[PDB]
Design a protein around this motif. Structure first.
Motif, PDB file in Angstrom:
ATOM      1  N   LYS A  78      -7.754  -5.947 -20.821  1.00 38.19           N
ATOM      2  CA  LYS A  78      -7.069  -4.839 -21.482  1.00 38.19           C
ATOM      3  C   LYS A  78      -6.606  -3.831 -20.427  1.00 38.19           C
ATOM      4  CE  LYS A  78      -9.411  -4.750 -25.994  1.00 38.19           C
ATOM      5  NZ  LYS A  78     -10.553  -4.148 -26.745  1.00 38.19           N
ATOM      6  N   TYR A  79      -5.320  -3.463 -20.436  1.00 42.03           N
ATOM      7  CA  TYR A  79      -4.826  -2.433 -19.531  1.00 42.03           C
ATOM      8  C   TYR A  79      -5.088  -1.052 -20.181  1.00 42.03           C
ATOM      9  CZ  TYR A  79      -2.284  -6.026 -16.840  1.00 42.03           C
ATOM     10  OH  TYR A  79      -1.948  -7.104 -16.040  1.00 42.03           O
ATOM     11  N   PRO A  80      -5.685  -0.088 -19.451  1.00 43.05           N
ATOM     12  CA  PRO A  80      -5.962   1.226 -20.068  1.00 43.05           C
ATOM     13  C   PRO A  80      -4.703   1.984 -20.456  1.00 43.05           C
ATOM     14  CG  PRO A  80      -6.318   1.302 -17.683  1.00 43.05           C
ATOM     15  CD  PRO A  80      -6.182  -0.153 -18.060  1.00 43.05           C
ATOM     16  N   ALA A  81      -4.734   2.642 -21.628  1.00 38.47           N
ATOM     17  CA  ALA A  81      -3.589   3.429 -22.097  1.00 38.47           C
ATOM     18  C   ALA A  81      -3.444   4.744 -21.289  1.00 38.47           C
ATOM     19  CB  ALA A  81      -3.749   3.743 -23.580  1.00 38.47           C
ATOM     20  N   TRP A  82      -2.247   5.352 -21.332  1.00 40.43           N
ATOM     21  CA  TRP A  82      -1.898   6.658 -20.754  1.00 40.43           C
ATOM     22  C   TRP A  82      -2.927   7.700 -21.282  1.00 40.43           C
ATOM     23  CZ3 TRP A  82       3.066   9.261 -23.231  1.00 40.43           C
ATOM     24  CH2 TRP A  82       3.271  10.530 -22.681  1.00 40.43           C
ATOM     25  N   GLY A  83      -3.604   8.424 -20.393  1.00 44.14           N
ATOM     26  CA  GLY A  83      -4.612   9.392 -20.807  1.00 44.14           C
ATOM     27  C   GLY A  83      -6.039   8.866 -20.928  1.00 44.14           C
ATOM     28  N   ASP A  84      -6.211   7.526 -20.964  1.00 42.12           N
ATOM     29  CA  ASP A  84      -7.544   6.911 -21.022  1.00 42.12           C
ATOM     30  C   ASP A  84      -8.287   7.078 -19.674  1.00 42.12           C
ATOM     31  OD1 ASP A  84      -7.102   5.910 -23.623  1.00 42.12           O
ATOM     32  OD2 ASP A  84      -7.090   3.765 -23.045  1.00 42.12           O
ATOM     33  N   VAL A  85      -9.614   7.010 -19.719  1.00 44.38           N
ATOM     34  CA  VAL A  85     -10.433   7.085 -18.505  1.00 44.38           C
ATOM     35  C   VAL A  85     -10.943   5.676 -18.234  1.00 44.38           C
ATOM     36  CG1 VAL A  85     -12.537   8.030 -17.425  1.00 44.38           C
ATOM     37  CG2 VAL A  85     -11.172   9.463 -19.002  1.00 44.38           C
ATOM     38  N   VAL A  86     -10.708   5.159 -17.027  1.00 46.09           N
ATOM     39  CA  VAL A  86     -11.205   3.850 -16.646  1.00 46.09           C
ATOM     40  C   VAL A  86     -12.271   4.027 -15.538  1.00 46.09           C
ATOM     41  CG1 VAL A  86      -9.167   3.538 -15.161  1.00 46.09           C
ATOM     42  CG2 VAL A  86     -10.571   1.550 -15.744  1.00 46.09           C
ATOM     43  N   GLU A  87     -13.438   3.350 -15.649  1.00 40.64           N
ATOM     44  CA  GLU A  87     -14.442   3.443 -14.580  1.00 40.64           C
ATOM     45  C   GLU A  87     -14.393   2.156 -13.763  1.00 40.64           C
ATOM     46  OE1 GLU A  87     -18.936   3.790 -15.188  1.00 40.64           O
ATOM     47  OE2 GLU A  87     -18.578   5.568 -13.929  1.00 40.64           O
ATOM     48  N   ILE A  88     -14.315   2.274 -12.440  1.00 38.42           N
ATOM     49  CA  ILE A  88     -14.274   1.097 -11.580  1.00 38.42           C
ATOM     50  C   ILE A  88     -15.490   1.091 -10.650  1.00 38.42           C
ATOM     51  CG2 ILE A  88     -12.945  -0.233  -9.905  1.00 38.42           C
ATOM     52  CD1 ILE A  88     -10.411   1.240 -10.891  1.00 38.42           C
ATOM     53  N   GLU A  89     -16.216  -0.036 -10.581  1.00 39.05           N
ATOM     54  CA  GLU A  89     -17.371  -0.225  -9.698  1.00 39.05           C
ATOM     55  C   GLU A  89     -16.967  -1.232  -8.589  1.00 39.05           C
ATOM     56  OE1 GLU A  89     -20.997  -1.942 -11.314  1.00 39.05           O
ATOM     57  OE2 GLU A  89     -22.154  -1.347  -9.540  1.00 39.05           O
ATOM     58  N   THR A  90     -17.277  -0.926  -7.334  1.00 35.07           N
ATOM     59  CA  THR A  90     -16.891  -1.779  -6.210  1.00 35.07           C
ATOM     60  C   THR A  90     -18.064  -1.969  -5.252  1.00 35.07           C
ATOM     61  OG1 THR A  90     -15.115  -2.183  -4.552  1.00 35.07           O
ATOM     62  CG2 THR A  90     -15.943   0.091  -4.723  1.00 35.07           C
ATOM     63  N   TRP A  91     -18.053  -3.116  -4.580  1.00 33.97           N
ATOM     64  CA  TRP A  91     -19.067  -3.456  -3.596  1.00 33.97           C
ATOM     65  C   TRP A  91     -18.475  -4.502  -2.661  1.00 33.97           C
ATOM     66  CZ3 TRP A  91     -19.153  -5.235  -8.613  1.00 33.97           C
ATOM     67  CH2 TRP A  91     -19.129  -6.621  -8.781  1.00 33.97           C
ATOM     68  N   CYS A  92     -19.112  -4.671  -1.496  1.00 40.15           N
ATOM     69  CA  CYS A  92     -18.672  -5.616  -0.478  1.00 40.15           C
ATOM     70  C   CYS A  92     -19.723  -6.693  -0.220  1.00 40.15           C
ATOM     71  CB  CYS A  92     -18.349  -4.866   0.804  1.00 40.15           C
ATOM     72  SG  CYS A  92     -16.923  -3.791   0.650  1.00 40.15           S
ATOM     73  N   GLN A  93     -19.316  -7.784   0.404  1.00 41.41           N
ATOM     74  CA  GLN A  93     -20.247  -8.846   0.770  1.00 41.41           C
ATOM     75  C   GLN A  93     -19.764  -9.514   2.046  1.00 41.41           C
ATOM     76  OE1 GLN A  93     -22.079 -11.634  -2.570  1.00 41.41           O
ATOM     77  NE2 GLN A  93     -23.381  -9.889  -2.026  1.00 41.41           N
ATOM     78  N   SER A  94     -20.696  -9.868   2.927  1.00 43.67           N
ATOM     79  CA  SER A  94     -20.403 -10.577   4.161  1.00 43.67           C
ATOM     80  C   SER A  94     -20.347 -12.078   3.805  1.00 43.67           C
ATOM     81  CB  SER A  94     -21.536 -10.325   5.155  1.00 43.67           C
ATOM     82  OG  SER A  94     -21.356 -10.998   6.387  1.00 43.67           O
ATOM     83  N   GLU A  95     -19.338 -12.827   4.295  1.00 43.83           N
ATOM     84  CA  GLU A  95     -19.275 -14.267   4.017  1.00 43.83           C
ATOM     85  C   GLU A  95     -19.400 -15.043   5.339  1.00 43.83           C
ATOM     86  OE1 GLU A  95     -15.870 -14.920   1.366  1.00 43.83           O
ATOM     87  OE2 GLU A  95     -17.237 -14.680  -0.335  1.00 43.83           O
ATOM     88  N   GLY A  96     -20.572 -14.921   5.965  1.00 44.98           N
ATOM     89  CA  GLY A  96     -20.854 -15.507   7.273  1.00 44.98           C
ATOM     90  C   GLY A  96     -19.878 -15.035   8.336  1.00 44.98           C
ATOM     91  N   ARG A  97     -19.350 -15.972   9.106  1.00 44.54           N
ATOM     92  CA  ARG A  97     -18.344 -15.694  10.131  1.00 44.54           C
ATOM     93  C   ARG A  97     -16.896 -15.820   9.586  1.00 44.54           C
ATOM     94  NH1 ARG A  97     -22.694 -17.470  14.204  1.00 44.54           N
ATOM     95  NH2 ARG A  97     -22.320 -19.713  13.947  1.00 44.54           N
ATOM     96  N   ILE A  98     -16.706 -16.308   8.339  1.00 45.97           N
ATOM     97  CA  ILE A  98     -15.366 -16.473   7.767  1.00 45.97           C
ATOM     98  C   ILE A  98     -14.628 -15.121   7.647  1.00 45.97           C
ATOM     99  CG2 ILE A  98     -14.018 -17.294   5.758  1.00 45.97           C
ATOM    100  CD1 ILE A  98     -15.210 -19.958   6.565  1.00 45.97           C
ATOM    101  N   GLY A  99     -15.294 -14.153   7.021  1.00 47.50           N
ATOM    102  CA  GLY A  99     -14.739 -12.833   6.741  1.00 47.50           C
ATOM    103  C   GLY A  99     -15.624 -12.062   5.780  1.00 47.50           C
TER     104      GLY A  99
END
Ligand SMILES: Cc1cc(N2CCNCC2)nc(C)n1
Ligand SMILES: Cc1cc(N2CCNCC2)nc(C)n1
Lengths: 268, 269
Positions: A78-99
Motif C-alpha cells: 500500500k502506498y501511503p496517502a497525502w498527509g499520512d504518516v509512514v514509519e520506516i525501520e532500517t538496519w544493515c548487515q555484513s555479507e562476508g567479503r562480498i559487500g
C-alpha cells in the motif's frame, strides 16, 4: 527519528507531502525510495559514519574507499496517502567479503500494518580508480558494532524475487523514452546522480496507460555504471508477461549499459 | 504545522533532508520553493479549501475556476544546512479584482532569525477554456474570512524588487540549456508540471562556475504559459551586470513560444 532500544536498527516517521504524491494521491515509488535513502542517512549519522555525503567508516577514509549500490529491490503493498504518516525501520548487515546490505520495513503509523519492504546490496569501491573490491577484515569488524549478528532479513524466503538474475533486454525494445538528461535537482551533495533518478528514468518508458490502470507492486534494479552530469540516457522497456516488464538504461551515444531491471504491476 | 492564535496565518517546521541539499550541504532554492508550496497546501487545507490538488473555494468549484501562478519571488539570506530545522510562516491577501497573493517568512528555528522571504501572485482562470479573469465579489468575501484585513507584506519596501517589470531576453542568448523535458516526478497530483520544475529549468542555463563560486540571493520568475507533459523547453540566460545579475527566458523548443521570463541576483561566496 532514533535508534531502537538495542541500538541495532533505526526508525523514523514521515508525513507524506503534497508534491510527493501521484494522480491517485498516494506517494510515488520515487518518494518511497527518497524516504529509504533519508532514513538510511540518519541511521549512518547516528552510528558514527562520516557527515560528508559518502557515509564512510574510519578504515574506509584511510583506504580511500566508498560504498556503491549494486541493487535496489522494493515491494509495496500500500502506498501511503497525502498527509499520512509512514514509519520506516532500517538496519544493515555484513555479507562476508562480498559487500553489505541495508534492509527496510515500512509501516502505517496508525494501523501498525506492514505496507512495504526493501533491500539494497552495496559493493566496496576505490574512490580514486573506481575499481570494485572485497570488504576487508577491518571493515567487517566495524559493521559488527552496529549490525545484528544473527540474520535479520526483510526478504527471508529461499529463492525470493530480491535475489533473482535479471537478463539483458534484446533490441528492438517494445517501448522507449530517449534523450533523458539529469538536471541539478537530480544530483546529490557530492555532484553524483542520485540513485532514485535511475528509478524515475526506468519508469519513463512504461506506457502512461499501464501507470493509469495499474499499481507498481515490485521493482528490482541492478546498477552497473554511473550516468555523469553531461551524459544522456535511453530508457528501454519490453513486456515479458499482473503485468511484468524487463528494463534497460543505456547511454544514448555508445549504448553502454548503466542499469537493468524488472517491474511487476497489478491491475487496480 | 498549525494555524497561529488569530487563525490568520499558518506555521510549519521542516527538517532539511540529505537529498534536499547541494554541494555546500545547504538546501537548494528548489528545496525551499517545494517547502513554500507544502506549507501553502497545509494552510489551504486548514482553512477549508478543496483536497483535490486544485485548492479551490466553494464559489470557484461552482464556477469551474482555479488559481494559476503569475509570479514567484524568493530572497534567501541563509540557506538551512542538512539536518537543520526551518520554520516557515505563510498567509494570503486579496488584491481587489486583480488576484490574490501568498507571502512567506522563513526563520532558523534555533536562533529565531529571519533567513528568507517570499511572495507569489495568483490570477483567476476558467479551468475549461483556460481564460484569465477578474476575482468576483463572492470570492473576495471568501478570502476575508481567513486573510488579515490590514495589509501584511513580506516585501513592504517602496519600489521593491518583487514588483519590478522583467524585460524579454533578445537573441542570441549568452548561455543556454536545450531540450529540457519533464518526467513523471516533475508532475503534480493533477498531472500538470509542478511550478518548482520551471525554477530548476531557469537555473540549468546558469554556468556551473557561477553556481560553484556564488550564492543565489534573489530569484523573480514570471509564469505565462504551461509546459505540457509532451512539450520540450529551451532555457536561455544573459548576464546583465561583487554581485552577478542575469536575465532568463524559457521557451518551447519548437515554435519558441514564451513560457517564463525571470531574473536572478547572485553574491560571491
Ligand atoms: C554505480 C556502480 C558503479 C560501478 N563501477 C564504476 C566503474 N568501475 C567499475 C564499475 N560498479 C557498480 C556495481 N555500481
Ligand atoms: C498567468 C498565466 C496564464 C496562463 N494562461 C492564460 C491563457 N490561456 C492559457 C493559460 N497560464 C499560466 C500558467 N499563467
Amino acid at each position: 527519528g532514533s535508534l531502537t532500544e538495542d541500538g541495532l536498527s533505526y526508525k523514523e516517521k514521515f508525513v507524506v507531502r503534497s508534491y510527493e504524491v501521484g494522480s491517485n494521491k498516494t506517494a510515488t515509488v520515487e518518494t518511497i525510495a527518497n524516504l529509504l535513502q533519508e532514513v538510511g542517512c540518519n541511521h549512518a549519522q547516528s552510528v558514527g559514519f562520516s557527515t560528508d555525503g559518502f557515509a564512510t567508516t574510519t578504515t574506509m577514509r584511510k583506504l580511500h574507499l566508498i560504498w556503491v549500490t549494486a541493487r535496489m529491490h522494493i515491494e509495496i503493498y500500500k502506498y501511503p496517502a497525502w498527509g499520512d504518516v509512514v514509519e520506516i525501520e532500517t538496519w544493515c548487515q555484513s555479507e562476508g567479503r562480498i559487500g553489505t546490505r541495508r534492509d527496510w520495513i515500512l509501516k502505517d503509523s496508525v494501523t501498525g500494518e506492514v505496507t512495504g519492504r526493501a533491500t539494497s546490496k552495496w559493493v566496496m569501491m576505490n574512490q580514486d580508480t573506481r575499481r570494485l573490491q572485497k570488504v576487508s577484515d577491518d571493515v567487517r569488524d566495524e559493521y559488527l558494532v552496529f549490525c545484528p549478528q544473527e540474520p535479520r532479513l526483510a526478504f527471508p524466503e529461499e529463492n525470493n524475487r530480491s535475489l533473482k538474475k535479471i537478463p539483458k533486454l534484446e533490441d528492438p525494445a517494445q517501448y522507449s523514452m530517449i534523450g533523458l538528461k539529469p538536471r541539478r535537482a537530480d544530483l546529490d551533495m557530492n555532484q553524483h546522480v542520485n540513485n532514485v533518478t535511475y528509478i524515475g528514468w526506468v519508469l519513463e518508458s512504461i506506457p502512461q496507460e499501464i501507470v493509469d490502470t495499474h499499481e507498481l507492486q515490485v521493482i528490482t534494479l541492478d546498477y552497473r555504471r554511473e550516468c555523469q552530469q553531461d551524459d544522456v540516457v535511453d530508457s528501454l522497456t519490453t513486456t515479458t508477461s499482473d503485468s511484468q516488464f524487463l528494463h534497460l538504461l543505456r547511454l544514448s551515444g555508445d549504448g553502454q549499459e548503466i542499469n537493468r531491471g524488472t517491474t511487476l504491476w497489478r491491475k487496480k
